[PDB]
């Protein structure tokens, strides 16, 4: 009561500059809810607002919608989806068995997006020629992330990295990075019959070429939002929709508990202690 | 070489030491006298970074910068003429001798308690030839009502 | 080697009927990757495939895309988003601070979708008249889930529950539940000036009216997929994009560690032990 | 400053009847920290206090210490320990 007629003070934590919820209409980063469907933008449109707080124009709204559409689930072998089958067979629920699976996105699986942007955004803005970038790395180890594929590289393309290749070719002026990305490819495709840009490699540069080529992002929200790790945000929003699809399949078929039998273990206990 | 009118309605001062309550205790005195601008320009504390500290001028939020060195207090804002120290006895002397080299400051008052009498008499020679009035140690502070107030003089409102 | 020329056997675990990934093109539940963009369906289209394994027709593909577009963030006060700010201020990373955030969707926050479908799907298919359904509950306690709103109910709608109301009115024949949903509303709106269908309540019935009205789902995949909890899958895919939107906001502003000061605690330690 | 001299009010959430931490010594459910080692109870002794808030007598303090000592790990085959090897190999 005493604060309502305004006589005391209070300091305020919890900055949270998104999604005004009290009042009569939920305002997003610049817009009420009903005004969104009058422009009728897709959920890429709210993916601009809730993440970047700029009205992103609808030639690229369909790009980031197309971007997570191709980074869906990738089969049950991968160590991301392999956990969330196990926590499905133990039969917990959905959301405590979705959250076991997003725990593996780290520095040796699935975070190859973040390495295939910060290896190229450094080596272009403070950059050097293509045939010394490759020369610098191949005197140190440290292979180029986003590049490497076991099955189909040359004269036999990936058939989905080329789906994005024309959609970034039409509605995207001013692409410095991706034309710098292809020129690191051409030297390396002569070097090995493998080593095309992977689908994680192109999105490592097709997303940063979405920022500094579109308007309303100058040079300071373009680099910091890759620095915080919003590029991981495209991934763990993307692979999250497949894990549940992995999960719902693992509960419809009504499987029992998994055990992982003893004939792979080979215990290496010492002599006596 | 001193001034005659020490404080006015256009006086600005910079405090030393993270003593934000007394900074708030100074800022509200500007509001009840309806002074046009706030008086505390910067807070000099060398053990943090350079950012902006939040306070409440009336009901709104105001951002007062915290600085790390004394020369960067001079660069963007050389109109400050009154410098205050609220540090303890263990660092009072070094915060003062480097200060009076910058002659744009015209008034210095020291609050700290526990100062040697030689360090008391070390300070008086320097402001004698330069002309800065010292209202130094074991002092609660001074008041010019309607215009300006030093320290927790008067206490709360 | 010996299994390759096929002489031994092996039993097989891991049933996983989704996302064929070895071969040359990633086949989804019925379709290769490139054939998806030739029909050019949105990510609602893959949301049909990866969850329900049927080619969902593209009048309802835009419904489930619109369905998670309105179940974005609901404000930074709610106990879902309140955790993921705290693990943001402690500064872990993105995907461990999305991980602590989805762990709160349970039986007292945000799972009201699951109660606002299985309270109505029971009381319609094995159903009774509207003015004894309300009479049955109001001799037991157990208030109707999906209904209850503190601010705007009557002569003043919430302006987004009506947004879905026409989009389910045009492209949706055969709606038994939602017309049965509105008739539970009309008796109750006369009973109290509050108690409109909430946005979580309508989606609790607009989604089950998506299943048993559209084709390719007869009545046996329509009920079991609400029984497993795939309707929670709409929610924790939906609220997962607002959580990161809090997180990128809570790291750009560069905040320090939170402490929750002592003057709310009031310790109730006993006398001596 | 206003609430310090106590003129306004405030309702209080967060009941938490365990582990007084402000003051000079961390009091547990009935006892300061240093008084625990003067009786010198094991961590079963704090397992009585932090869970059940009763001074559990030290014939059974050694039981619940023995109780979790035999319910340790049970080999890497089991679906509990099988996950945490996988998220170890991914190196988080």
From Swiss-Prot, chains A, C:
The modification N6-acetyllysine is found at residues 122, 142, 152, 251. Homotetramer. This is ATP-citrate synthase. Coiled coil: none annotated. The gene is ACLY. The chain holds residues 827 to 1099 of 1101 of the full protein. It is found in: Cytoplasm, Cytosol. In the N-terminal section; belongs to the succinate/malate CoA ligase beta subunit family. Transmembrane segments: none annotated. The modification Phosphoserine is found at residue 13. It comes from the Eukaryota. It comes from Homo sapiens. Phosphorylated by PKA and GSK3 in a sequential manner; phosphorylation results in activation of its activity. ISGylated. Catalyzes the cleavage of citrate into oxaloacetate and acetyl-CoA, the latter serving as common substrate in multiple biochemical reactions in protein, carbohydrate and lipid metabolism.
């Amino acid at each position: 009561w005493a604060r309502e007629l305004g006589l005391i003070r209070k300091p305020a934590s919890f900055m949270t500059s998104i999604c005004d919820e009290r009042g009569q209409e939920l305002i997003y980063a610049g817009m009420p809810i009903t005004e969104v469907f009058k422009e009728e933008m897709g959920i890429g449109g709210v993916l601009g607002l809730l993440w970047f707080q700029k009205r992103l124009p609808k030639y690229s709204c369909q790009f980031i919608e197309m971007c997570l559409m191709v980074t869906a689930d990738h089969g049950p072998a991968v160590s991301g989806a392999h956990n969330t089958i196990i926590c499905a067979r133990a039969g917990k629920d959905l959301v405590s068995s979705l959250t076991s699976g997003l725990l593996t996105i780290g520095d040796r699986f699935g975070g190859a997006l973040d390495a295939a942007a910060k290896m190229f955004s450094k080596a272009f803005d403070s950059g050097i020629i293509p045939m010394e970038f490759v020369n610098k790395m191949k005197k140190e180890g440290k292979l180029i992330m986003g590049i490497g594929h076991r099955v189909k590289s040359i004269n036999n393309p990936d058939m989905r990295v080329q789906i994005l290749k024309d959609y970034v070719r039409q509605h995207f002026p001013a692409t410095p990075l991706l034309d710098y990305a292809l020129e690191v490819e051409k030297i390396t495709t002569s070097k090995k019959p493998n080593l095309i840009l992977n689908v994680d490699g192109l999105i490592g540069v097709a997303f940063v070429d979405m920022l500094r080529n579109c308007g309303s992002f100058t040079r300071e929200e373009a680099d910091e939002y890759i620095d915080i790790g919003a590029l991981n945000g495209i991934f763990v929003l993307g692979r999250s929709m497949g894990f549940i699809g992995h999960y719902l399949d693992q509960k419809r078929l009504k499987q029992g508990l998994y055990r992982h039998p003893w004939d792979d273990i080979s215990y290496v206990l010492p002599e006596h202690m | 070489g001193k001034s005659t009118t020490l404080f006015s309605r256009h006086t600005k001062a910079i405090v030393w030491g993270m003593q934000t309550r007394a900074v708030q205790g100074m800022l509200d005195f500007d509001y009840v006298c309806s002074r046009d601008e706030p008086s505390v320009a910067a807070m000099v504390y060398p053990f943090t970074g350079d950012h902006k500290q939040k306070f409440y001028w009336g009901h709104k939020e105001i951002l007062i910068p915290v600085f790390k060195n004394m020369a960067d207090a001079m660069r963007k804002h050389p109109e400050v003429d009154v410098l205050i120290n609220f540090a303890s006895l263990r660092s009072a002397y070094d915060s003062t001798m480097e200060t009076m080299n910058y002659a744009q400051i015209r008034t210095i008052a020291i609050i700290a308690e526990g100062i040697p009498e030689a360090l008391t008499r070390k300070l008086i020679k320097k402001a004698d030839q330069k002309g800065v009035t010292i209202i130094g140690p074991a002092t609660v502070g001074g008041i010019k009502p309607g215009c300006f107030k030093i320290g927790n003089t008067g206490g709360m409102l």
